[PDB]
Amino acid sequence: SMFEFDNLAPMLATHGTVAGLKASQWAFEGMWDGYRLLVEADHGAVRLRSRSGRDVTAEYPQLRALAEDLADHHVVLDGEAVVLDSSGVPSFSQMQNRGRDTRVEFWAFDLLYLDGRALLGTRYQDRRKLLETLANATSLTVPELLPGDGAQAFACSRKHGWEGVIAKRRDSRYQPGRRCASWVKDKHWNTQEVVIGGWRAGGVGSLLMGIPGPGGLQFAGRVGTGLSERELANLKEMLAPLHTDESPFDVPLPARDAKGITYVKPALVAEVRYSEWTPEGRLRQSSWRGLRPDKKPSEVVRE
């Protein structure tokens, strides 16, 4: 049969503003900071497909039982694998640094195929109804839409501490692998890539962030929030080989910022969320999202 899960790439959203959109036209979903997954559940047997289009089934054994209540069905799902922090908010860093005791959940937000019917050409409104009929009172988690028009859904989403809202046009088709104007993503917090220039201990109580410039890293502040247990342990192994006596910053750090510090060669790129930039170039109310081993320091610029 000719729907090819093995040829499927996820649909992508366009950065925009949702506050002026109406629920009559747009479905407001919460934005889940996790790992994007396509899921084929063929009468209970689950296969997972990354956005890059590769089998990642073996990387999430906690999801092997995802379809335990769906053994009578053959479905393709779209959703986010999440790991919930102590607030029950999906945490990206707890996902990327997950262990065997780590609870991974799959939160489904689309249905692409159901018992021999491919649904790429079916309107979102109708796919969602089939998704609800499939998952009601099962262990398959389908987060509901946020109530209200756009500004209310966005506010509610902020109240929960979620990442933002994705508005999906109720009449829209599913376009694999395409970034479309029919999905609008709107994030609550700004986000900045940084280069790690040093660390303090309580261990690693915090990191010293910088933006590359002509004379070295321009100090962008200290991040300590959003980091716990498993990740810091890995941070210590990534930092160890980078030990250096020379500071990488373009001005010697103020004494308060340099207290108990070890400098590292400016190699690791991380990502943080922040409210605003101070007039002197520090990140306000920064919090850790995670490390970005795909990026290298020479691409970090003030965004």
Ligand SMILES: Nc1ncnc2c1ncn2[C@@H]1O[C@H](COP(=O)(O)OP(=O)(O)OP(=O)(O)O)[C@@H](O)[C@H]1O
């Ligand atoms: N409810 C949801 N529906 C669809 N996608 C979601 C949802 N929640 C989270 N995501 C995914 O989380 C990410 C949030 O957008 P963000 O701008 O943070 O992503 P990105 O990695 O910067 O860019 P990209 O759009 O290329 O992934 C998007 O990948 C989005 O597809």
Ligand SMILES: [Mg+2]
């Ligand atoms: Mg994201």
Ligand SMILES: [Mg+2]
């Ligand atoms: Mg992404």
